[PDB]
Enzyme design. Structure first.
Site, PDB file in Angstrom:
ATOM      1  N   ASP A   1     -16.115  -2.788 -16.289  1.00 47.79           N
ATOM      2  CA  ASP A   1     -16.263  -1.346 -16.513  1.00 47.79           C
ATOM      3  C   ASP A   1     -16.362  -0.613 -15.110  1.00 47.79           C
ATOM      4  O   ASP A   1     -17.255  -0.750 -14.449  1.00 47.79           O
ATOM      5  CB  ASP A   1     -17.577  -1.217 -17.267  1.00 47.79           C
ATOM      6  CG  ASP A   1     -17.974   0.380 -17.457  1.00 47.79           C
ATOM      7  OD1 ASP A   1     -18.681   0.898 -16.711  1.00 47.79           O
ATOM      8  OD2 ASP A   1     -17.480   0.692 -18.456  1.00 47.79           O
TER       9      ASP A   1
ATOM     10  N   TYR B   1     -15.609   6.186  -9.401  1.00 44.29           N
ATOM     11  CA  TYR B   1     -16.104   4.947  -8.552  1.00 44.29           C
ATOM     12  C   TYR B   1     -15.243   4.874  -7.472  1.00 44.29           C
ATOM     13  O   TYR B   1     -15.651   4.298  -6.391  1.00 44.29           O
ATOM     14  CB  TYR B   1     -16.501   3.794  -9.404  1.00 44.29           C
ATOM     15  CG  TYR B   1     -17.361   4.041 -10.525  1.00 44.29           C
ATOM     16  CD1 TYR B   1     -18.407   5.153 -10.865  1.00 44.29           C
ATOM     17  CD2 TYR B   1     -17.276   2.994 -11.689  1.00 44.29           C
ATOM     18  CE1 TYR B   1     -19.134   4.930 -12.107  1.00 44.29           C
ATOM     19  CE2 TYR B   1     -18.184   3.122 -12.792  1.00 44.29           C
ATOM     20  CZ  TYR B   1     -19.027   4.078 -12.958  1.00 44.29           C
ATOM     21  OH  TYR B   1     -19.776   4.126 -14.192  1.00 44.29           O
TER      22      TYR B   1
ATOM     23  N   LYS C   1     -12.849   5.616 -16.931  1.00 43.27           N
ATOM     24  CA  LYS C   1     -13.233   6.880 -17.507  1.00 43.27           C
ATOM     25  C   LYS C   1     -12.754   8.105 -16.853  1.00 43.27           C
ATOM     26  O   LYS C   1     -12.277   7.890 -15.556  1.00 43.27           O
ATOM     27  CB  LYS C   1     -14.630   6.781 -17.309  1.00 43.27           C
ATOM     28  CG  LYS C   1     -15.468   5.535 -17.637  1.00 43.27           C
ATOM     29  CD  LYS C   1     -16.964   5.744 -17.706  1.00 43.27           C
ATOM     30  CE  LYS C   1     -17.589   4.270 -17.755  1.00 43.27           C
ATOM     31  NZ  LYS C   1     -17.520   3.679 -16.423  1.00 43.27           N
TER      32      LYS C   1
ATOM     33  N   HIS D   1     -16.178  10.657 -19.256  1.00 42.45           N
ATOM     34  CA  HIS D   1     -17.389  10.155 -18.583  1.00 42.45           C
ATOM     35  C   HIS D   1     -18.545  11.005 -18.902  1.00 42.45           C
ATOM     36  O   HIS D   1     -19.602  10.521 -18.921  1.00 42.45           O
ATOM     37  CB  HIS D   1     -17.063  10.275 -16.967  1.00 42.45           C
ATOM     38  CG  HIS D   1     -17.862   9.268 -16.074  1.00 42.45           C
ATOM     39  ND1 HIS D   1     -17.258   8.818 -15.030  1.00 42.45           N
ATOM     40  CD2 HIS D   1     -19.046   8.876 -16.372  1.00 42.45           C
ATOM     41  CE1 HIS D   1     -18.132   7.906 -14.439  1.00 42.45           C
ATOM     42  NE2 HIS D   1     -19.155   7.971 -15.091  1.00 42.45           N
TER      43      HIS D   1
END
Ligand SMILES: [Cl-]
Length: 280
Positions: free
Chosen positions: A47, A52, A77, A110
């Site tokens: 994930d 990120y 996401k 998200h």
């Protein structure tokens, strides 16, 4: 086992119930190694998220592992600033090229964005959802869902969707167990996935005493409780020993009294932002 426990999404896709979160894992060797070690230990689900900034490393770790890409479930996401229809299609393409894949297994919105942004800019998550529906029709993504949506945000999507969200990934742990959201999501066949499933929570005396009965740690107890509540769980670690320990939860079972004691810990306390109040 960790490679075999599956939840069947509403569209029939089999999503591994247990995966590695790479939230806050730095881009580069740290994320590559975490992914490679997880896959080597039997994880078949990673994930990540555009925000990120480590999707390249996830792809590199997957390639390093030697596990065939078709045997691994990759979630990523859409970040909040890219919501909108054409911008969502663009964001998806950028995530896909960074991961180095031809298709993504699950794509999530998200966040819905907080109420003041919704009031000023509109509910752009609805047009993002229409773009998700197009990506799904085009076979570019195997499953679509959302993250950090409350019941009211889901009701907004359910009133306009041609494809129901398949997953809702939210902050969920023994101090914030999301019982009301889980009841609604069960009614609508939306699978609930826990972020921050391990939350001083791992020092909790009730949790460590339960662990002591099965020779398991508090973290292992929390993750087994996720599994028994039929939740998808994606604990994050960058350390090989922890990545392996977290997945070693399929050789024991929590009994009724144990599960009751863990459910008793709930205080509706969040460590993360409340999706209604967020200023992003
Ligand atoms: Cl019991």
């Amino acid at each position: 086992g960790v490679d075999k426990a599956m939840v069947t999404l509403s569209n029939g896709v089999k999503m591994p119930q247990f995966g590695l979160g790479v939230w806050q894992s730095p881009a580069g060797e740290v994320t590559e190694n975490a992914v490679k070690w997880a896959l080597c230990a039997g994880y078949r689900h990673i994930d990540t998220a555009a925000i990120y900034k480590n999707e390249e490393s996830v792809g590199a770790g997957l390639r390093a592992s030697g596990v065939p890409r078709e045997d691994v479930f990759i979630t990523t996401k859409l970040w909040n600033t890219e919501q909108g229809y054409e911008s969502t299609l663009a964001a998806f393409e950028e995530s896909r090229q960074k991961l180095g894949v031809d298709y993504i297994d699950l794509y999530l919105i998200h966040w819905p964005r907080g109420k003041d942004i919704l009031s000023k800019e509109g509910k752009k998550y609805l047009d993002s959802w229409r773009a998700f529906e197009q990506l799904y029709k085009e076979k570019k993504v195997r499953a679509i869902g959302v993250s950090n949506f409350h019941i009211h945000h889901l009701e907004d999507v359910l009133a306009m969707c041609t494809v129901t969200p398949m997953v809702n990934q939210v902050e969920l742990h023994p101090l914030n167990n999301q019982a009301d959201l889980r009841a609604f999501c069960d009614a609508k066949q939306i699978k609930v996935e826990a972020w921050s499933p391990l939350g001083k929570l791992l020092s909790n005396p009730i949790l460590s005493a339960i662990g002591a009965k099965y020779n398991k740690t508090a973290a292992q107890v929390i993750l087994r409780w996720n599994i028994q509540k039929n939740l998808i769980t994606i604990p994050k670690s960058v350390h090989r020993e922890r990545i392996e320990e977290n997945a070693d939860i399929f050789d024991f079972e929590l009994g009724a009294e144990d599960v009751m004691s863990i459910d008793a810990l709930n205080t509706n306390s969040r460590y993360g932002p409340d999706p209604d109040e967020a200023q992003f």
